[PDB]
Amino acid sequence: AAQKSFRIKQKMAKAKKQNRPLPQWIRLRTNNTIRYNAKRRNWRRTKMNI
Amino acid sequence: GKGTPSFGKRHNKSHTLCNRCGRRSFHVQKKTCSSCGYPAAKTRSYNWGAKAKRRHTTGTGRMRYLKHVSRRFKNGFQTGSASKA
Amino acid sequence: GRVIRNQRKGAGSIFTSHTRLRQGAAKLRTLDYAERHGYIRGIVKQIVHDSGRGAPLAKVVFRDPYKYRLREEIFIANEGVHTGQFIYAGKKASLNVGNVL
Amino acid sequence: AGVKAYELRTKSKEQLASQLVDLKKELAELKVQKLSRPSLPKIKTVRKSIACVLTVINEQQREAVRQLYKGKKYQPKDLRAKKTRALRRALTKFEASQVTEKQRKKQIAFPQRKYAIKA
Amino acid sequence: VFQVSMKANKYQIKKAVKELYEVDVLKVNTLVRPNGTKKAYVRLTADYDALDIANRIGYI
RNA sequence: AGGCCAGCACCUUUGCUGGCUCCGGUGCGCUUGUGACGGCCCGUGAAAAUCCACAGGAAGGAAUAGUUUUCAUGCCAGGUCG
RNA sequence: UCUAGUGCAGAUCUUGGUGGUAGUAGCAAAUAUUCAAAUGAGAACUUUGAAGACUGAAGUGGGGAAAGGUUCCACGUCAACAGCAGUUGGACGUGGGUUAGUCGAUCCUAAGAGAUGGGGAAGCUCCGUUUCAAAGGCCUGAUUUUAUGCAGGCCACCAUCGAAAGGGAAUCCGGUUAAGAUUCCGGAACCUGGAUAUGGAUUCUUCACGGUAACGUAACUGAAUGUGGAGACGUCGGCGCGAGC
RNA sequence: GGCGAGAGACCGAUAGCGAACAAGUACAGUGAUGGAAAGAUGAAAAGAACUUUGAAAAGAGAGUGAAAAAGUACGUGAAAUU
RNA sequence: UUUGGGGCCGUUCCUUGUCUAUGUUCCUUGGAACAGGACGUCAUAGAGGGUGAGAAUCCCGUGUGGCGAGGAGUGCGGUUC
RNA sequence: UUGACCUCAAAUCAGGUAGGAGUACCCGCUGAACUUAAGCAUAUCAAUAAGCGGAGGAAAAGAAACCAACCGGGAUUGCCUU
RNA sequence: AAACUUUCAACAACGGAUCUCUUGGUUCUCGCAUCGAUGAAGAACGCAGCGAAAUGCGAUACGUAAUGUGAAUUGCAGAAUUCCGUGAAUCAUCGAAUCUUUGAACGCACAUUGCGCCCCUUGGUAUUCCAGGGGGCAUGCCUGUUUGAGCGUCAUUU
What we know:
The structure is cut from a larger assembly and holds chains A, B, C, D and E. Chain B has helices at 4-9, 50-56, 66-74, and strands at residues 15-16, 26-27, 32-33. Helix content of chain B is 26%, strand content 7%. Chain E is α+β, with helices and mostly antiparallel strands. Chain E has a three-stranded antiparallel sheet with strand order 1-3-2, covered by helices on one side. Chain E is globular and about 30 Å long. Chains in contact: A-E, B-D, D-E. Chain D binds chain E through residues 29, 32-33, 35-36, and chain E through 57-59. Chain D: This is Large ribosomal subunit protein uL29A.
């Protein structure tokens, strides 16, 4: 909520920095087996449980 | 209305995060984690919770010191430094 | 079969007494030296209602003989006692109502 | 490019502090140049040079303190031997080679003679 | 407007600015950017000019 | 300041200039706060921090100079997290 | 020749996949939409304008707590989602954004939880929270080898946690942004803590005067200790008064 | 179990450790706990220049390649079903 | 009748570096020859892996011995006080 | 009076030490039931699982308050066997 | 007769079996004994010129130093003096260091990035107030030191 705690805000910031796609140069590298991100997280679908 | 509307009434966290395990198991009104046993000294484990041990045991982390322990035993726990042959 | 009400009543999480508004425990003055060799005067300052208790209480006030101090006590009021009333406690005290002979 | 630990070791303490502050100012300049620019690795060279400088300084101080506490017991708990808890809590070869004079006599008088068996 | 360690406070920021930039600073308002960082709005006296010292630093 | 209006200006940053901004009345009205009373109780309706005052009289001090900073004024700072 | 995890139609078998049903049931609560223009490849639904209607202040309004986490705002943008559509979107992509001495937390304690001392328990741990305990720190200084001892003196509660709705030190107007503001800008105030100088006041009757009195004042010594008040308080009724409407 | 080495009449991606892959992962649940799926282009990206239709996606040509009957919906490519 | 302690060089153990032979000759097919064929070499090395398809002989290695480096160390062989 | 002793205490006194983890094996405590008995209560499952305490590279044990009854043997553990 | 239904085949589809592979698993054997208050196992948050994760790492942050090899890393960009050399490198090895906040977690606490005490030092005209920096304060127990307490108790005083 608005009146929140710093731990919550810390985890939220980390989540926000996670919530974005792959880099395409990583898609370009050698021996690469990654096509997409699968740790992707959207507030509508799944909650953090914190 | 034991189901749906009561789930609507459901909004106050019984559990929150713990500072020893980080799992959201810290019962606030008891002041205990349901997974690590905080604020107890020991770590909570059971030999019926074999999977739990396997999940929370040694090697699932960085082992910031313990890998180097075996390297150092190999080299015999040596002090000092090299000599520039 | 279950454990029944009269047996749950002894652990008493909910059966404990509701002890908020109670002004204190209504005990007599302690039996030190003045009471057991002479007498001592205090004053009923205020009668009040104790919660859970049908008998009122009387905030009496004494003096400490050992220090400049005003140890206040709580007495259960008898019929006739009133405010501003001198209470004599002790052995050679006089036999009137409110005294602690 | 960058810096070199051996010539730093030749240099002195205050020289190293001046080198350090110079590098730090340069790194701040580089970070503003970085927000202006797309890419900059010179900042990484700077990072590792600062790290080596601080390392050298630490080693100089620790060596000073070692040769200060030299040849006496009760040196501190970061200049002592790290080996392991159990080995530190273990006996010494002295304390383990200690014997009763009784067993010393029995040894000296009757030790395991080296014999052989053909004739 | 600066980006700042989470371990820092306004006294530290004020002194650090006075040192690094040879200015005097009126007041300091800080917040935590939800990317996890700290941000500082730092107001000087009317003597100095923030534009001057910023295009001195080399950003603008 | 803000609000209501009028006028004159311009690719334009755009404004610029003027006036008015007043005096009242009522009420079982609505909401709310409050004051003094009344009624109810085998129900009489938290605590602590904190603050103040008073009793008391340890002590400390004036004269070519002292005493006071609960009067006024003046100076500095006021963190952490949201 | 040897050796087996050796041959499936079934086990309401397991896993995965696929069908007919079937372009079917159905997409029907919440009074209701229409005309034109613009954009765009494309408009029943996007945007604007015009009209008609609704919620009708116990509202489909405006702000918040819990919770949620960046959905907020903008630019681009429609492969998937928005059970039709889609040029739009709480979607996709890239960024930006939350400024406090005065608002809260922090402090206080409530119900209560919970160490210590001690006692039980094979033991994890249990009881208990002032207890059968040697349970501490507060002030003036005194010296001027000198920092802080010694001189004294004082007191004995005797952890800690526990409320973002209880108690509680103190901030208001106007303006401002794409999105923030009792926080930022301008202006005008207050409080706490700590320093300190002048003025003022008072005094040779050494620590103020006036008032019958209620009591008044710009101030106008006062330690230890102790007493008292505020904090500190239900509910309903009608009456009065005030503010806003 | 830990660390390091070697081997097999073992399993060969619905098998074998739950995990041959960013697996104790995503994900669910208040929580204890639960707990997946998912390997293969080609020797080499040479991953399709250029033209044309289309709003575009894509198509048809072209071309690479030994092979596009290898086009990241990629080895082969069964059946059900179409 | 019999005795102790230190040094050194070796040796032992551990860790570990490096050196240690032999065809890429001809023909056919194929995108590529590691395939087929002919001719040869080494072998105390034909174990395994790799490289454009079954590679002893192209590469790393294997086998054989060698030459070192740093540690443990009294297990003992010689020497020295 | 001054100085010892005994016992009990305090110091952010000098130095150290234990705590927790992992736990395959090891030493101990504690302690079931499903089950089998064609039922079931003793019994069996089992002096087991779970729980708790404590170690090492092995642990534990161990130089006989032993076995034996022989023409006597001779710490301990373990394998074959009994 | 078409259409439709069904059947068979060819080609195309859905789908992912079969075949062939394999940095994995499993089982057997051999060998060694090495966590932690000198702060572990684990957790949280954070660090790259351009990364979300994995792996690595800790404000010296995909790493520093030291040693050895001996000129690469690679998706892009950049860098070159770093190439007949105290020297490339996501190299190997690793004996010196750093080691955020936590955690047996140890100043008191904790759903608070909360609240203190001491020492040294700096600034603010300051032993006291404020802030900054550096260093510190857990408990139980052992041995020892110092200061003690108690008619528990001894002697010796005049």
